[PDB]
């Protein structure tokens, strides 16, 4: 089982850069995994923000968050970081880091899903 | 009983000494590992001796300690495997006793070593890519 | 705090018990040393200090390997030799009654028969001398082995004299030898060495007595898998040999009969002079002293106040009931009844003579369907040998009596090998090892 | 007679040249070292060829020269073994002549190399301990 | 086939140091080859200047040019350089770099010789 | 149904059933065997 834990500051001033970390336990960040960053606004639905591939390093971002969202990996420390520039009051939300993958153990195959507890980030001056 | 030196140059002379003393004569043991009713026995013996040596060399080379007699690695020592201190291992025990004590937890260390070596190779390639 | 990491060491001196196949080392023979590797002039032995090993003679695997190789060599040596298929013909036998004593009366038969020749349409009339143990009545007789299987004749150039053999292990394996004296073949041996391979072991084949063996360096040694159980043979090793002189004094004559193209059968022509039985001599005082030592050592395991009896064999075949051996090519079977006949209670130049017989049709190992016809030897034959141990068995042994009776045993030849390979074992090295240390890659 | 180049690409083409010229074509010799009356002979030949190559590789690896064709070590050149200069060896002699001259003092050099490699390995481990 | 190309400045002032380069294609400078530097004066015969061995590195110079001529190799860049100090008006000439060698391939041996097009160097203030 | 070349008549056709068909074979004669010794340790088993 892959365990994901979110961390970062609880408050970020407006127009600053929000930095978040997600630490992975039980699996290697450099493996053939996709790590996805999603957020949920208060009293609203979820909104996928982006994701990164552990092996090649290619990153795919939502068009709405393009130009301000960055996702990076760290295999030596075994965690992946997220940066969001020019955060405004509308960016207050609960952020989650998740991953989905097929495990093909010889004869058998199984779909595995993992999410983190999530971290609440409030943007205000 | 203290302050006496012991040096062994035999094949298995250091079998009865401590681990620290016995770790200084690895080469003498390393040399020997390779070298009608009776000819077939000789041939089978030669084949088996070659096979075991090749298996050992492959296992050593997979972990990244190829061409080395002493090689420490990145894998931490899990405290569940043992709890003694270095003073009571390298100066109060023999290799036979240590092997008898640790034989239950051999394969896990091998798998961890292989995975760590593969990850290190991938990281080295990524670093050299730049 | 600890901050310890795994470290790999190659070449660690660690070994484990294992089973493998050993090969020759040795300096016309049935025990072919031609395909056996030469032995080094100066063998190397490395004593291991402060090393105590576990030993068990009764579960050694080298004994089975030695038995298998001995049987294989014996079978291989007999492949290129004459097959005595034509010999299964009806015989006409009479008694040999000239210059015969009162004990050899009726022990020889003068048998005439018809035989083939080199040309396949001509026959010859021949005669020979046979032992009574070889012929069975059908005034008409036939060889005993004819209704079981046809079987070969030993080639007259290969010698049966034992030759020492050293059994050496491959690379990656080691031979551990227990140098501790007074070791009874089981348990922890504290004094140990590693030898390149074993010393010369003569494959001497005999029953009820061990001949030309190795002597104990301290005292008489008694060994048994479970001395409490009476179904396990007891092995006795003497610390000093007892000389025995065996002889066949008949002046035999050998003649050749051509039974086909390049095929000759060696028959006994006639005996020149007197006819007398073969016999063996053993000293009396030496035997009494040896039995005194043996009973003294036996009293340790069976109490210090018991009565120790030595008696005759129980019964069965002639091979197991009699001390059987070969001396100069002739197969002797002898009656060791004057030796194990005495009772011991807790508290000069004469000798014992065993009179005994010779045989020619041999079923060497405990098998059925394969003989070995020994060609006759020419002239008187005599040999001298050492006695360096015994194979005994405790008859009964119930608590109803306060006395112990020991009788000679034998039959199984593995016990002959077990008396020599009791201080050796084979192990395999495991150089790889993992330890905790401080250095980090 | 001077100022002429020579290049060889045969199996043993450089056998007649000088040591310096012959030391440029080691790989061509390295390639070839590995590769009812007749089948047993073929099997014995294969086994012998494998055994000799494995012995050579083990001997090379014990000295720390594993995976190298020109590996120079730390053992100094004792003057008792030879007294010529480099100009008169690498430009005035052939490998066969050098082997014929230096066959007497091979095992001593082998043992010194083994001991030096073991000491270097232990020193490296001690340095990495810190 | 071994290809040799000359390069260097077309003019050198008097008393300066003339530097020339010869680049080798199709062969390794570090092999068992001899690289020779020769010059031809205007309207006169040839005059061998020097040469160098690729493997050992020994250099042999003309006695007339001794004390002012240097020839060096470069295996990594695969070319060899020539330096001549205190060049005077008499040093104007066409410089060539050449090489001759025996190639013993299996059964057959051949003699190969290669020359460069050459570079004209004029010495004057 | 399998065949190397079904168009050619020289190639056999292999048929594999999806279910088996039971077949019961029997020899009902009560035979007797007798051994005749034809040599040393050699017997021939005839029908008595
Ligand atoms: C325990 O050990 C002792 C000694 O260690 C053993 O006693 C020795 O036994 C050997 C073998 O019997 C004996 O050596 C023989 O001595 C005879 C008398 O000198 C020799 O005649 C005989 O040679 C003949 O046999 C050889 C093959 O073994 C032939 O190669 C040789 O040519 C001889 O054969 C010729 O002669 C015969 C007869 O005329 C003829 O048929 C042949 O065709 C050929 O022409 C052996 O050399 C020793 O002398 C004994 N030692 C002592 C001190 O007596 C004892 O046997 C061992 N115990 C056991 C149970 O094995
Ligand atoms: C065994 O029997 C044969 C044949 O009966 C004996 O050979 C004969 O010996 C007599 C001498 O008494 C001769 O006159 C005959 O000519 C011999 N017969 C042949 C066919 O040669 C032989 O002596 C007997 N041997 C013994 C030990 O009794
Ligand atoms: C050898 O063979 C001959 C014949 O080839 C045997 O002599 C015959 O014996 C039978 C007895 O069953 C008689 O009926 C014949 O009349 C005999 N023939 C002759 C020509 O005498 C002879 O007995 C055989 N020898 C042995 C020892 O059995
Ligand atoms: C019978 O035993 C005696 C004594 O144990 C043996 O004689 C010894 O033989 C060895 C041969 O290596 C000599 O080194 C000893 O010096 C001999 N001892 C004496 C007291 O002379 C004799 O060899 C044995 N017989 C056989 C056939 O092995
Ligand atoms: C040695 O032999 C004795 C005698 O057989 C063994 O003791 C017997 O063990 C069996 C096993 O259940 C019992 O049924 C018998 O009643 C026992 N008999 C006696 C007299 O004790 C003994 O176990 C053997 N030793 C070993 C080590 O096996
Ligand atoms: C075994 O012992 C007997 C005596 O019990 C020996 O018999 C004597 O042998 C000699 C031979 O030199 C004769 O001179 C005597 O006449 C024999 N006496 C008797 C009473 O028979 C016999 O020789 C011994 N055999 C061996 C091989 O030692
Ligand atoms: C067995 O034979 C040996 C040798 O034939 C006998 O030893 C000889 O004994 C006589 C009589 O005491 C001595 O004169 C000789 O010097 C001895 N020879 C040797 C080489 O020792 C031995 O006594 C015989 N044993 C028996 C029981 O008969
Ligand atoms: C051991 O000794 C006993 C008695 O001394 C032998 O028993 C004799 O056996 C023979 C058969 O060969 C009989 O004819 C005798 O009548 C028996 N004697 C008695 C008193 O009954 C026994 O045979 C001997 N053992 C061996 C193996 O010969
Ligand atoms: C072994 O020797 C003993 C001792 O002589 C034999 O016992 C004798 O056997 C005969 C029968 O052949 C009896 O007449 C004697 O009375 C027995 N002697 C004693 C003292 O009882 C024994 O028979 C021999 N073994 C064999 C198989 O014959
Ligand atoms: C299957 O078999 C048919 C029949 O033989 C093959 O067709 C023949 O091919 C040969 C080859 O030249 C011709 O000569 C015949 O005239 C053909 N006969 C017919 C009826 O077409 C056909 O080629 C075979 N299939 C394969 C794949 O070889
Ligand atoms: C095969 O089928 C036949 C019937 O067609 C069987 O014949 C019968 O066998 C039984 C045996 O129990 C007899 O009682 C009947 O009288 C037989 N009838 C006839 C008409 O022969 C035959 O037994 C079968 N055999 C097998 C091996 O199944
Ligand atoms: C001999 O070994 C034992 C344990 O195997 C050890 O306790 C003892 O100290 C050793 N003897 C010496 C002199 O080191
Ligand atoms: C030969 O002698 C034995 C023993 O005396 C006897 O049993 C047998 O009947 C005799 N055979 C003859 C005289 O044919
Ligand atoms: C051969 O004959 C003997 C004696 O007649 C007998 O004991 C044996 O059993 C016979 N062999 C077989 C195989 O029956
Ligand atoms: C003798 O054998 C017994 C078998 O139970 C064993 O326990 C004992 O240790 C042996 N003797 C020695 C000195 O090892
Ligand atoms: C046996 O007989 C032969 C032939 O007569 C003779 O040469 C030999 O000496 C005899 N044997 C003995 C021991 O006398
Ligand atoms: C057995 O010993 C007794 C002694 O009581 C003796 O009378 C008898 O003759 C001996 N038997 C043999 C065969 O030697
Ligand atoms: C065959 O005959 C034997 C001998 O009478 C008998 O025991 C057996 O039962 C018969 N077989 C059947 C099938 O009845």
């Amino acid at each position: 089982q892959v365990w994901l834990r979110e961390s970062g500051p609880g408050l970020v001033k407006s127009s600053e850069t929000l930095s978040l970390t997600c630490a992975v336990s039980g699996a290697s960040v450099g493996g053939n995994y996709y790590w996805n960053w999603i957020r949920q606004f208060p009293g609203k639905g979820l909104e996928w923000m982006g994701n990164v591939h552990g092996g090649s390093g290619n990153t795919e971002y939502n068009p709405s968050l393009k130009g301000r969202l960055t996702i990076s990996r760290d295999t030596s420390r075994g965690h992946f970081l997220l940066h969001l520039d020019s955060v405004t009051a509308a960016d207050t939300a609960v952020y989650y880091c998740s991953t989905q993958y097929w495990r093909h153990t010889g004869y058998d195959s199984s779909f595995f899903d993992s999410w983190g507890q999530g971290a609440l980030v409030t943007v205000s001056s | 009983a203290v302050g006496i030196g012991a040096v062994f140059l035999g094949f298995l002379g250091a079998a009865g000494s401590t681990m620290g003393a016995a770790s200084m004569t690895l080469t003498v043991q390393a040399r020997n590992l390779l070298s009608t009713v009776w000819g077939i026995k000789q041939l089978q013996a030669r084949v088996l001796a070659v096979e075991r040596y090749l298996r050992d060399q492959q296992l050593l080379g997979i972990w990244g300690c190829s061409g080395k007699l002493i090689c420490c690695t990145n894998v931490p020592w899990n405290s569940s495997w043992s709890n003694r201190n270095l003073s009571e291992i390298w100066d109060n025990m023999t290799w036979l006793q240590w092997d008898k004590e640790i034989s239950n937890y051999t394969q896990i260390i091998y798998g961890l070593l292989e995975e760590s070596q593969n990850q290190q190779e991938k990281n080295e390639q990524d670093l050299l890519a730049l | 705090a600890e901050n310890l990491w795994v470290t790999v060491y190659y070449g660690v001196p660690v070994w484990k018990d294992a089973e493998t196949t050993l090969f020759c080392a040795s300096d016309h023979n049935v025990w072919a040393t031609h395909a056996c590797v030469p032995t080094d002039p100066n063998p190397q032995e490395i004593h291991l200090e402060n090393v105590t090993e576990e030993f068990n003679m009764w579960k050694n695997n080298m004994v089975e390997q030695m038995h298998t190789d001995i049987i294989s060599l014996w079978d291989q040596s007999l492949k290129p030799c004459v097959k005595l298929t034509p010999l299964c013909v009806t015989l006409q036998c009479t008694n040999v009654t000239n210059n015969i004593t009162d004990d050899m009366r009726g022990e020889l038969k003068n048998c005439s028969f018809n035989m083939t020749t080199e040309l396949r349409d001509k026959k010859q009339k021949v005669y020979s001398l046979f032992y009574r143990l070889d012929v069975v009545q059908i005034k008409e007789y036939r060889l005993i082995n004819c209704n079981t299987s046809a079987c070969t004749q030993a080639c007259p150039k290969v010698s049966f004299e034992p030759i020492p053999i050293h059994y050496c292990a491959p690379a990656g394996f080691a031979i551990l030898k227990c140098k501790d004296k007074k070791f009874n073949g089981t348990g922890p041996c504290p004094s140990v060495s590693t030898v390149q391979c074993t010393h010369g072991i003569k494959p001497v084949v005999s029953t009820q007595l061990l001949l030309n063996g190795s002597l104990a360096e301290e005292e008489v040694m008694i060994r048994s898998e479970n001395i409490t159980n009476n179904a396990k043979n007891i092995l006795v090793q003497f610390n000093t040999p007892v000389q025995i002189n065996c002889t066949r004094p008949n002046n035999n004559t050998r003649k050749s009969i051509r039974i086909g193209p390049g095929q000759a059968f060696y028959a006994t022509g006639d005996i020149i002079g007197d006819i007398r039985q073969a016999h063996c001599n053993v000293s009396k005082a030496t035997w009494n002293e040896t039995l005194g030592k043996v009973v003294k050592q036996l009293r340790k395991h069976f109490g210090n106040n018991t009565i120790i009896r030595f008696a005759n064999s129980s019964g069965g075949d002639l091979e197991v009931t009699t001390h059987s051996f070969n001396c100069g090519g002739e197969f002797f079977y002898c009656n060791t009844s004057g030796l194990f006949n005495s009772t011991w209670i807790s508290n000069s130049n004469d000798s014992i003579t065993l009179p005994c017989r010779i045989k020619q049709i041999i079923n060497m190992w405990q098998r059925i369907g394969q003989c070995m016809y020994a060609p006759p030897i020419q002239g008187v034959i005599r040999c001298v040998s050492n006695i360096t141990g015994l194979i005994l068995t405790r008859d009964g042994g119930s608590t109803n009596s306060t006395t112990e009776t020991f009788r000679p045993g034998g039959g199984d030849m593995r016990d002959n090998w077990r008396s020599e390979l009791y201080k050796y074992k084979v192990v395999k090295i495991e150089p790889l090892g993992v330890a905790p240390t401080r250095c980090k890659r």
Side-chain angles (χ1 to χ4, degrees), chain A, chain B, chain C:
Chain A
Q1 193 174 3
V2 185
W3 298 101
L4 309 169
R5 182 172 180 169
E6 294 89 340
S7 59
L11 70 101
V12 182
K13 301 185 178 182
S14 297
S15 316
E16 290 197 344
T17 299
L18 162 59
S19 94
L20 290 174
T21 302
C22 178
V24 190
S25 207
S28 157
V29 162
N32 192 17
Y33 290 71
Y34 271 107
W35 315 107
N36 346 87
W37 273 108
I38 299 143
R39 57 187 187 179
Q40 179 170 34
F41 301 109
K44 294 187 182 182
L46 321 175
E47 185 192 54
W48 172 77
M49 311 155 38
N51 59 28
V52 60
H53 193 248
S56 68
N58 297 342
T59 56
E60 298 283 340
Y61 307 111
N62 188 302
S64 69
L65 292 105
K66 207 171 183 178
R68 54 188 217 164
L69 166 58
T70 301
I71 298 164
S72 65
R73 75 201 171 178
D74 197 340
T75 64
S76 67
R77 304 189 183 177
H79 58 67
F80 51 105
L81 304 317
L82 173 132
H83 292 299
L84 184 65
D85 283 323
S86 153
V87 302
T88 77
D91 295 305
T92 291
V94 189
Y95 291 73
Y96 305 85
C97 59
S98 77
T99 191
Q100 315 202 61
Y101 65 96
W102 273 105
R103 172 184 166 90
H104 314 261
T105 172
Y107 38 81
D108 229 10
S109 320
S110 36
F111 196 109
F112 277 0
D113 200 66
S114 284
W115 286 68
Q117 76 293 357
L120 300 105
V121 178
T122 83
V123 183
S124 172
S125 54
Chain B
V2 189
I4 61 134
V7 306
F8 315 86
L9 330 170
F11 175 47
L12 291 150
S17 291
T18 38
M19 303 180 63
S23 91
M24 291 156 196
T25 79
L26 303 172
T27 36
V28 75
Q29 282 102 242
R31 301 208 293 255
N32 169 264
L33 304 177
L34 204 56
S35 265
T36 314
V37 162
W38 307 115
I40 313 313
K41 298 187 131 179
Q42 272 263 100
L43 197 139
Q44 297 282 50
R46 289 156 79 193
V47 165
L48 181 67
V50 166
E51 298 236 290
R52 291 179 75 246
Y53 169 85
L54 288 193
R55 180 214 60 176
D56 249 358
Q57 290 302 299
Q58 165 169 33
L59 216 57
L60 217 65
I62 282 281
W63 304 337
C65 305
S66 188
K68 284 181 140 283
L69 269 62
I70 311 175
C71 160
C72 39
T73 40
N74 274 126
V75 169
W77 182 252
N78 197 321
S79 325
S80 312
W81 301 330
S82 159
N83 331 297
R84 310 167 125 87
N85 323 305
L86 310 195
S87 181
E88 292 291 326
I89 288 167
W90 294 101
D91 280 316
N92 228 34
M93 199 174 302
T94 314
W95 272 111
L96 276 147
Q97 308 183 28
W98 182 248
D99 169 40
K100 232 145 58 171
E101 191 173 343
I102 291 282
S103 52
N104 266 323
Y105 309 122
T106 302
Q107 299 291 308
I108 287 156
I109 301 165
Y110 290 10
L112 293 171
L113 288 152
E114 143 173 338
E115 179 69 354
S116 159
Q117 171 58 11
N118 207 348
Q119 269 150 218
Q120 173 163 21
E121 218 91 87
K122 265 185 296 203
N123 287 358
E124 271 201 85
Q125 197 222 36
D126 263 341
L127 190 147
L128 281 153
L130 298 173
Chain C
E2 280 72 12
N3 62 88
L4 306 178
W5 323 82
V6 305
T7 310
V8 195
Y9 296 80
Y10 187 61
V12 160
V14 164
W15 55 68
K16 288 278 163 44
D17 261 300
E19 270 158 30
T20 193
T21 78
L22 314 98
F23 58 87
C24 273
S26 57
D27 295 353
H28 310 90
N29 203 264
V30 193
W31 335 112
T33 185
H34 318 86
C36 284
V37 183
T39 308
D40 294 292
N42 275 56
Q44 311 188 331
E45 161 160 25
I46 314 300
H47 77 310
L48 315 186
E49 318 195 17
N50 186 340
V51 195
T52 87
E53 249 290 286
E54 201 95 344
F55 282 90
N56 185 13
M57 52 147 45
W58 305 107
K59 286 309 220 163
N60 223 327
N61 193 248
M62 284 180 289
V63 177
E64 290 285 336
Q65 292 220 342
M66 195 183 176
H67 194 56
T68 291
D69 310 3
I70 291 283
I71 282 164
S72 293
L73 293 172
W74 178 272
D75 276 16
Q76 194 204 50
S77 152
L78 277 172
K79 230 201 169 58
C81 291
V82 173
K83 179 75 72 165
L84 295 181
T85 289
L87 256 292
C88 278
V89 74
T90 190
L91 317 167
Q92 297 218 340
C93 304
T94 77
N95 271 342
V96 180
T97 48
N98 75 14
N99 294 357
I100 62 106
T101 75
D102 317 276
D103 50 350
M104 270 285 264
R105 214 201 301 298
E107 223 72 48
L108 268 151
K109 297 270 185 291
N110 190 341
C111 299
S112 96
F113 47 97
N114 282 308
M115 191 53 47
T116 57
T117 70
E118 289 158 330
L119 307 185
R120 72 132 190 95
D121 56 5
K122 298 277 171 185
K123 299 263 173 297
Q124 52 183 334
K125 197 176 177 195
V126 283
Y127 80 90
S128 300
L129 294 183
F130 290 114
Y131 284 108
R132 195 184 65 73
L133 294 177
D134 294 356
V135 291
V136 54
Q137 198 159 8
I138 191 186
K139 206 169 168 285
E140 292 186 348
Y141 291 75
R142 59 155 196 81
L143 297 174
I144 49 157
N145 78 92
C146 279
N147 72 335
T148 308
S149 100
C151 42
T152 76
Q153 164 178 260
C155 282
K157 292 309 194 223
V158 308
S159 205
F160 295 119
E161 183 66 8
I163 301 293
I165 307 174
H166 313 246
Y167 264 109
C168 318
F173 294 83
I175 297 273
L176 299 177
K177 161 162 150 176
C178 170
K179 288 196 309 198
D180 168 42
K181 307 196 323 196
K182 74 182 61 203
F183 170 49
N184 67 5
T186 311
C189 175
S191 185
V192 186
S193 76
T194 288
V195 83
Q196 179 50 285
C197 44
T198 76
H199 68 285
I201 289 157
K202 287 172 287 200
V204 165
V205 197
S206 91
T207 81
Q208 275 199 29
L209 296 174
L210 314 181
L211 305 164
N212 286 350
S214 286
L215 318 151
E217 317 96 323
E218 213 176 68
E219 47 163 31
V220 168
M221 290 298 318
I222 288 160
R223 286 145 190 148
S224 175
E225 174 155 34
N226 182 12
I227 196 134
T228 295
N229 196 7
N230 61 80
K232 307 313 204 89
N233 290 314
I234 298 157
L235 266 55
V236 182
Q237 176 173 18
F238 299 162
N239 66 342
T240 188
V242 195
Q243 198 168 39
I244 182 162
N245 294 339
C246 290
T247 193
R248 199 257 292 152
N250 283 357
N251 197 342
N252 252 40
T253 316
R254 184 205 270 187
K255 64 184 178 176
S256 156
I257 292 154
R258 293 158 150 221
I259 56 166
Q263 305 203 108
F265 162 65
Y266 300 104
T268 291
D270 255 338
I271 290 135
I272 288 153
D274 263 26
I275 290 168
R276 305 179 284 187
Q277 58 174 11
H279 60 283
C280 300
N281 285 335
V282 77
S283 199
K284 201 156 157 169
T286 313
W287 190 246
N288 203 240
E289 168 173 359
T290 307
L291 279 184
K293 297 174 182 164
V294 166
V295 70
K296 167 162 76 228
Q297 250 57 62
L298 271 159
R299 261 187 222 294
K300 228 169 287 309
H301 311 73
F302 287 100
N304 207 347
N305 59 344
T306 44
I307 298 144
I308 306 301
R309 268 254 304 289
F310 288 109
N312 255 3
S313 285
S314 277
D317 306 3
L318 197 79
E319 294 84 348
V320 297
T321 305
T322 46
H323 173 41
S324 84
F325 64 104
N326 97 90
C327 158
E330 294 264 79
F331 279 83
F332 291 65
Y333 299 77
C334 307
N335 181 12
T336 62
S337 167
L339 310 179
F340 311 110
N341 164 29
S342 57
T343 180
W344 303 74
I345 48 154
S346 180
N347 67 336
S348 285
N349 202 0
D350 57 353
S351 36
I352 298 156
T353 296
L354 321 170
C356 59
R357 302 152 117 169
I358 301 103
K359 240 171 71 174
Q360 262 164 320
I361 290 159
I362 312 297
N363 288 270
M364 191 47 258
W365 323 114
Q366 296 175 324
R367 299 189 292 192
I368 290 128
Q370 325 195 35
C371 327
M372 179 263 271
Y373 181 86
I377 306 299
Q378 223 172 351
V380 305
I381 82 189
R382 164 151 171 300
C383 54
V384 314
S385 324
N386 290 346
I387 309 173
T388 78
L390 315 161
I391 296 157
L392 296 176
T393 197
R394 203 161 43 85
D395 153 37
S398 192
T399 59
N400 311 308
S401 57
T402 71
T403 76
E404 309 292 356
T405 82
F406 298 94
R407 316 182 169 280
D412 198 20
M413 222 62 68
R414 280 182 206 77
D415 298 3
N416 263 79
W417 321 140
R418 192 187 317 289
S419 55
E420 294 270 76
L421 302 169
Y422 73 99
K423 68 187 164 174
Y424 290 88
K425 81 187 287 189
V426 52
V427 296
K428 97 188 178 282
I429 315 310
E430 294 189 327
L432 258 169
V434 302
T437 344
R438 299 200 184 282
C439 58
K440 214 172 81 73
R441 173 145 66 185

